[PDB]
Design an enzyme around this catalytic site. Structure first.
Site, mmCIF file in Angstrom:
data_model
loop_
_atom_site.group_PDB
_atom_site.id
_atom_site.type_symbol
_atom_site.label_atom_id
_atom_site.label_comp_id
_atom_site.label_asym_id
_atom_site.label_seq_id
_atom_site.Cartn_x
_atom_site.Cartn_y
_atom_site.Cartn_z
ATOM 1 N N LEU A 171 -5.769 3.181 10.845
ATOM 2 C CA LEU A 171 -5.366 3.902 9.434
ATOM 3 C C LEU A 171 -5.644 3.142 8.233
ATOM 4 C CD1 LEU A 171 -2.558 6.265 10.871
ATOM 5 C CD2 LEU A 171 -4.918 6.615 10.807
ATOM 6 N N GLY A 172 -5.418 1.948 8.255
ATOM 7 C CA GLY A 172 -5.408 1.030 7.113
ATOM 8 C C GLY A 172 -5.422 -0.533 7.487
ATOM 9 N N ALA A 203 -2.845 -6.793 4.031
ATOM 10 C CA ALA A 203 -2.427 -8.358 4.398
ATOM 11 C C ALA A 203 -2.053 -8.724 5.496
ATOM 12 C CB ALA A 203 -1.930 -8.931 3.151
ATOM 13 N N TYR A 204 -0.920 -8.034 5.785
ATOM 14 C CA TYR A 204 -0.171 -7.958 6.921
ATOM 15 C C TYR A 204 -1.175 -7.885 8.330
ATOM 16 C CZ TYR A 204 -0.650 -3.045 6.427
ATOM 17 O OH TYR A 204 -1.132 -1.869 6.305
ATOM 18 N N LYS A 249 2.563 0.096 12.608
ATOM 19 C CA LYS A 249 2.407 -0.759 11.672
ATOM 20 C C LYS A 249 2.389 -2.209 12.448
ATOM 21 C CE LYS A 249 3.102 -2.611 7.032
ATOM 22 N NZ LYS A 249 3.770 -2.139 5.488
ATOM 23 N N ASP A 268 5.782 -0.568 -5.951
ATOM 24 C CA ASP A 268 4.259 -0.622 -5.810
ATOM 25 C C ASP A 268 3.673 0.868 -5.780
ATOM 26 O OD1 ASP A 268 1.756 -1.801 -6.234
ATOM 27 O OD2 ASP A 268 1.634 -2.242 -3.874
HETATM 28 C C1 LIG Z 1 -7.043 10.920 9.624
HETATM 29 C C2 LIG Z 1 -6.163 10.046 9.205
HETATM 30 O O1 LIG Z 1 -5.125 10.105 9.660
HETATM 31 N N1 LIG Z 1 -6.217 9.302 8.048
HETATM 32 C C3 LIG Z 1 -5.485 8.540 7.229
HETATM 33 C C4 LIG Z 1 -6.083 7.806 6.269
HETATM 34 C C5 LIG Z 1 -5.291 6.829 5.252
HETATM 35 C C6 LIG Z 1 -4.087 6.543 5.895
HETATM 36 C C7 LIG Z 1 -3.349 7.176 6.934
HETATM 37 C C8 LIG Z 1 -1.970 6.941 7.240
HETATM 38 C C9 LIG Z 1 -1.380 7.865 7.928
HETATM 39 N N2 LIG Z 1 -0.176 7.951 8.232
HETATM 40 C C10 LIG Z 1 0.516 6.795 7.973
HETATM 41 N N3 LIG Z 1 1.737 6.564 8.254
HETATM 42 C C11 LIG Z 1 2.288 5.438 7.640
HETATM 43 C C12 LIG Z 1 3.260 4.580 7.713
HETATM 44 N N4 LIG Z 1 3.328 3.536 7.112
HETATM 45 C C13 LIG Z 1 2.206 2.744 6.493
HETATM 46 C C14 LIG Z 1 2.490 1.605 5.883
HETATM 47 N N5 LIG Z 1 2.668 0.812 5.318
HETATM 48 C C15 LIG Z 1 1.018 3.471 6.515
HETATM 49 C C16 LIG Z 1 1.117 4.998 7.276
HETATM 50 C C17 LIG Z 1 0.038 5.885 7.135
HETATM 51 C C18 LIG Z 1 -1.331 5.932 6.948
HETATM 52 C C19 LIG Z 1 -4.464 8.197 7.493
#
Ligand SMILES: CC(=O)Nc1cccc(-c2cnc3[nH]c4cnc(C#N)cc4c3c2)c1
Length: 264
Positions: free
Chosen positions: A13-14, A17-18, A36, A121
């Site tokens: 999903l991302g 740095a971590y 994460k 941030d």
């Molecule tokens: C299809 C799909 O699920 N696309 C997509 C795109 C970008 C971020 C995410 C995303 C979706 N759900 C999340 N829940 C989180 C909790 N903590 C962090 C941190 N730091 C990042 C996310 C996160 C990112 C999902």
């Protein structure tokens, strides 16, 4: 029930740095969470803060397991992805959609500030959307306590993201935390309504910033924004953080309270 703590990691999903955030789906229930992955070879504080958080516009924390050197933070999954990908470059988004996202943003920030937490941030990259397009504040890796036992602590660490940072963080040794988050929320609003960021940073050397203080609102991004939301932005993006609008007063602003959007 056997197997019910087993999760398949199915998609990145991302990647900061971590390390990474992966979509995880439960072997048994098929519940989707965000996991994460933070290779400790700073996150102890991110977890500490996450444990404090319980609100509909704040990404929920479920728990964590450490296995050797990597920490696994189990977090609410937001299937709508990042606010960033709802902002069309140079256009922005429909004003009723921006107002709803801004409402939800405020509720989240009000909550955080109520529990003595500053995000530090806020940006469209860190504001996530669930399946019903509800906004949730994410990523507390730079977040910090600014009020404990009803006593405020002034900040001094320079952190955040330059185009989103408030001018005092560049000019003063110390500053109040809350006006910094309010400022970043205004730059987020600008982006929503203009599909562009107004300046590389809010310094007197920054030409686009000087123009804003010179009130040249016949220039972009400001020309694209209607007078009513523009009037709110004139109250938020105020250089003196003591004179900057507070969130209780943002809730009284005419644009904030303008009916614009039909229900789902
Ligand atoms: C299809 C799909 O699920 N696309 C997509 C795109 C970008 C971020 C995410 C995303 C979706 N759900 C999340 N829940 C989180 C909790 N903590 C962090 C941190 N730091 C990042 C996310 C996160 C990112 C999902």
């Amino acid at each position: 029930v056997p197997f019910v703590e087993d999760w398949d990691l199915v998609q990145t999903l991302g990647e900061g740095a971590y390390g990474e955030v992966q979509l995880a789906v439960n072997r048994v229930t098929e519940e989707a969470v965000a996991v994460k992955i933070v290779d400790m070879k700073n996150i102890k504080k991110e977890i500490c803060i996450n444990k404090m958080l319980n609100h509909e516009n704040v990404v929920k924390f479920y728990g964590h397991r450490r296995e050797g050197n990597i920490q696994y933070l189990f977090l609410e999954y937001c299937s709508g992805g990042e606010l960033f990908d709802r902002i069309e470059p140079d256009i922005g988004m429909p004003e009723p959609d921006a107002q709803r996202f801004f409402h939800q943003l405020m509720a989240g920030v009000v909550y955080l500030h109520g529990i003595g937490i500053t995000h530090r941030d806020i940006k469209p990259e860190n504001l996530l959307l669930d399946e019903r397009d509800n906004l949730k504040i994410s990523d507390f890796g730079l977040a910090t306590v600014f009020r404990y036992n009803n006593r405020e602590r002034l900040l001094n660490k320079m952190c955040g993201t330059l185009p989103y940072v408030a001018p005092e963080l560049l000019k003063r040794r110390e500053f109040h935390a809350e006006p910094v988050d309010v400022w970043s929320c205004g730059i987020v609003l600008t982006a929503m309504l203009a599909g562009e960021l107004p300046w590389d940073q809010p310094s007197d050397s920054c030409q686009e910033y000087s123009d804003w203080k010179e009130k040249k609102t016949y220039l972009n991004p400001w020309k694209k924004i209607d007078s009513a939301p523009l009037a709110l932005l004139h109250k938020i993006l105020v250089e003196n953080p003591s004179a900057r609008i507070t969130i209780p007063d943002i809730k009284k602003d005419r644009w904030y309270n303008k009916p614009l959007k039909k229900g789902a």
